[PDB]
Amino acid sequence: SEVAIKMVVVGNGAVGKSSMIQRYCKGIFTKDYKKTIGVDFLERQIQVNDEDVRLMLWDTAGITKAYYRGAQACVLVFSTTDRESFEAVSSWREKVVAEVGDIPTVLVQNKIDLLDDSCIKNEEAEALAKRLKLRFYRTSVKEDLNVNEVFKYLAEKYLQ
Numbered sequence: 456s457e458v459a460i461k462m463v464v465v466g467n468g469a470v471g472k473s474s475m476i477q478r479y480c481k482g483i484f485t486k487d488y489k490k491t492i493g494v495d496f497l498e499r500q501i502q503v504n505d506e507d508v509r510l511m512l513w514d515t516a517g518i519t520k521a522y523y524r525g526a527q528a529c530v531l532v533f534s535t536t537d538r539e540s541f542e543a544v545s546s547w548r549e550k551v552v553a554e555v556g557d558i559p560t561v562l563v564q565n566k567i568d569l570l571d572d573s574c575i576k577n578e579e580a581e582a583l584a585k586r587l588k589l590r591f592y593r594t595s596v597k598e599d600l601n602v603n604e605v606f607k608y609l610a611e612k613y614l615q
């Protein structure tokens with residue numbers, strides 16, 4: 456037997472959800488932006504506590520019922536250069552809780568490589584994560600920076 460975990464990745468359009476999943480599961484950086492059509496399924500096998508676990512990442516455009524059904528962990532994503540995507544974070548957390556209840560969740564500020572054009576103050580983001588009682592990562596899918604740690608953390612939080 457091998458444990459599988461269904462993970463959803465949610466957040467406003469263009470924050471980098473598909474890119475994060477394609478980086479994590481296939482090791483590529485998708486530079487072109489196309490809004491995701493339908494639901495896409497990707498997976499990666501990782502070892503947590505020396506046991507192989509299969510992460511099943513569900514990707515859709517930022518359907519509702521089937522997408523969230525059986526979700527076991529969640530990545531909440533906003534973008535360093537998209538203020539509206541940050542201001543919607545609380546609303547996304549309420550939406551996941553309403554649909555699947557209390558599951559392991561992590562908060563991610565993506566595109567941290569564009570920090571020269573940031574519209575989110577470091578204290579603002581860290582405060583939001585504290586209020587929502589969520590661990591917080593700053594990632595760059597483009598630079599493969601902290602992407603692996605986001606998903607390993609969720610897998611450890613689910614298995615423990």
Ligand SMILES: Nc1nc2c(ncn2[C@@H]2O[C@H](COP(=O)(O)OP(=O)(O)NP(=O)(O)O)[C@@H](O)[C@H]2O)c(=O)[nH]1
Nearest residue numbers: 468469470471472473474486490491517566596597
């Ligand atoms: N500079 C930079 N661009 C990024 C990063 N991650 C993703 N992008 C870019 O952001 C754009 C949108 O990314 P995408 O993964 O499609 O976003 P999405 O959240 O899946 N959008 P949708 O909800 O419409 O499907 C793409 O041009 C992609 O290359 C990052 O870390 N840095």
Ligand SMILES: [Mg+2]
Nearest residue numbers: 473490491516
């Ligand atoms: Mg997408």
